[PDB]
């Protein structure tokens, strides 16, 4: 009926209104080869969208217009979107209204640029963009809750109390798994696993999803893992290389708990969320203690809820019970939350049509934000 288009910071997801499985599950990454003196290989594309770039990853320069979600060259992602239509659903955007994703503390010019692409370029009959965390809590089925949203490009805890705007405590945080992967390939380089390009990064981010977990006592677990030679597990890679990871698996996510590893001049994720907590009414924060909504697909980690929980629990009073809300499908609950969100009665009226945009210009984005 509509177009529920998710814009994942890493991969992508999409589909119509009310669709259950995300159709455009492909890398939301841009890539181009080394356009040099050689000729074309039997005729082929210039830009390589997702899986195409993922396929011939040895030469295609894996880039992103995305800067922790901030798209620089909108041409990239819009051509990706065109092909995404004519790739997954093969439907024009003019017959079905679109639904998009966003993150707080985003410059409005980004969304307005996006908007004018949908109208001037895509000619969508109606359109809408909302925060991913809303879809996460939507999938949970709540309205009161601190939706700790965590994309693989950004992070933003979203405290809500009966679907109400609390942006003073809501804080965007450009925390990407890519950043961890940066540090990870760096520490691998001193471990003899010296690799440079982004193809290496794709392989090791998949390895990050393979064995990089979250321990419980980083230094103690670090010393024991240093002693636990069996924990330094190996895996013969697609290439003849094998790996060795025992510390690295949990050594790398401590940068989230400790900005010191990167010198982010910030706080660790657990107390960062607690800092966002500290910007509210402590008695409704009690509900937020119960509303420990751990969301964002970049939270699919082994031993992460107890870690984070225990940390903030040490920060919280005894009566302030942490009650984790974290379904393993929270990664899909973003797009699926938008997919079922499209089926909302009020939302079928809450729209930004052609003339609504044109006759208002990009100014309509402000009140039509949320």
């Amino acid at each position: 009926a509509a177009l529920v288009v998710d814009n994942g910071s890493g991969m992508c997801k999409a589909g119509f209104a009310g669709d259950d499985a995300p159709r455009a599950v492909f890398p939301s990454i841009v890539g181009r080869p080394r356009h040099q003196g050689v000729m074309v290989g039997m005729g082929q594309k210039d830009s390589y969208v997702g899986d195409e770039a993922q396929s011939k990853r040895g030469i295609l320069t894996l880039k992103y217009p995305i800067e922790h979600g901030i798209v620089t060259n909108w041409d990239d992602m819009e051509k990706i979107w065109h092909h995404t239509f004519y790739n997954e659903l093969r439907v024009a955007p003019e017959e079905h209204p679109v639904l998009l994703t966003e993150a707080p503390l985003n410059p409005k010019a980004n969304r307005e640029k996006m908007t004018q692409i949908m109208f001037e370029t895509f000619n969508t009959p109606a359109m809408y963009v909302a925060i991913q965390a809303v879809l996460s809590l939507y999938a949970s089925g709540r309205t009161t809750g601190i939706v700790m949203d965590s994309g693989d490009g950004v992070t933003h805890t979203v405290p809500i109390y009966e679907g109400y705007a609390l942006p003073h405590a809501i804080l965007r945080l450009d925390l990407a798994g890519r950043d961890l992967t940066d540090y990870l390939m760096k520490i691998l380089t001193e471990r003899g696993y010296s690799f440079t390009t982004t193809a290496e990064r794709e392989i090791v981010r998949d390895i990050k999803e393979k064995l990089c977990y979250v321990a419980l006592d980083f230094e103690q677990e670090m010393a024991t893992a240093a002693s636990s030679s069996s924990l330094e597990k190996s895996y013969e890679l697609p290439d003849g290389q094998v790996i060795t990871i025992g510390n690295e698996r949990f050594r790398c996510p401590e940068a989230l708990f400790q900005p010191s590893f990167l010198g982010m001049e910030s706080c660790g994720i657990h107390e960062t969320t607690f800092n966002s907590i500290m910007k509210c009414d402590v008695d409704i924060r009690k509900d937020l203690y119960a509303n420990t909504v751990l969301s964002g697909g970049t939270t699919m980690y082994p031993g992460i809820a107890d870690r984070m929980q225990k940390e903030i629990t040490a920060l919280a009073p005894s009566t302030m019970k942490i009650k984790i809300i974290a379904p393993p499908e929270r990664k899909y609950s973003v797009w699926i939350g938008g997919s079922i969100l499209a089926s909302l009665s009020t939302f079928q009226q809450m729209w930004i049509s052609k003339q609504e945009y044109d006759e208002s210009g990009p100014s309509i984005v402000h009140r039509k934000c949320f």
Binding site: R34, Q36, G37, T61, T189, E190, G192, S194, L262, G263
Partner: protein, 370 residues
Amino acid sequence: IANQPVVIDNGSGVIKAGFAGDQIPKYCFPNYVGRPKHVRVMAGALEGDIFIGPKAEEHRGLLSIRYPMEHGIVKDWNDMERIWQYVYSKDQLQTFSEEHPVLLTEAPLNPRKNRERAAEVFFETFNVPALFISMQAVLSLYATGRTTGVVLDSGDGVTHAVPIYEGFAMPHSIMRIDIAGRDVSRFLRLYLRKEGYDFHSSSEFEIVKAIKERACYLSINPQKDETLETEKAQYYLPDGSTIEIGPSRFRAPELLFRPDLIGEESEGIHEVLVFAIQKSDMDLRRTLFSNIVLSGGSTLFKGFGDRLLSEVKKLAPKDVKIRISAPQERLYSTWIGGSILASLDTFKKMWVSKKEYEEDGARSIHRKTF
């Protein structure tokens, strides 16, 4: 030991050494592993392969020379050992490891394994009672006297551009490229092969490297001089063979800044330096523009610094005064600073004793390393 410390002007392509008090590394020679070009199974061949200096500078169409440290990655450990023994001999050191303190210098992107393995040889085969491993940028700063600075090096393949203010160990400011004149000359001889000049042997290519260090420059108008019809000045080999060079005399080195047709779309350290600029802050950036240091041997080029000046001028915005310090002995600047560091009393406490190495080893290396 309480003797004159061995000041070493280390390197992947050029490794020299001397002592404290000396103003010059007494025996200047590059990094190379000289093996014969023939089967040394039959008696009366170039066996031993410990051909450093005149032995390598003796046989030309009979030696297939090798190179151990490849971008800070040394694999010919035993070949390094025999080169060390050549140095330890009375032609270069005239003393022993036990008899004199030794100073080791490094650069970033060096895995711990190289340091550990080299320290094993240096404290077990050779036995330095006063040995210390350090950097090279620090020594270049010692030579320049500065402490605040965007230090750069132009080794054989060693190129780190880390902005270091007042000797501040800033590992997040690390911007190291592992490529220089080595592969530049390799594809410059590929150009020679494009115009019919094959140089497949090491020495056969070492002559080409002598041209690289002799008849190679940076035409500050690369595409303009490229579009301009060249004249191709004739070079004369030790054989005296007439060889024209022309555009290729500056093509491959200008290709460092413009890696367009490499496949390895590198940067040209100015871009990497702008990335390091981003790592720094405008208040410090403004100062560090004036605080730029160059090192290594690949800096030696006609129109080198001025071309890079033009590069950054096209990069940096207005009211940005940049100064790039670069003496004539960028190679020796490391050795000069090594003698300066040798003259430091803190350095005496900074070094790891042989017994200290026996106590910990790798942990002592990476803990007492700085």
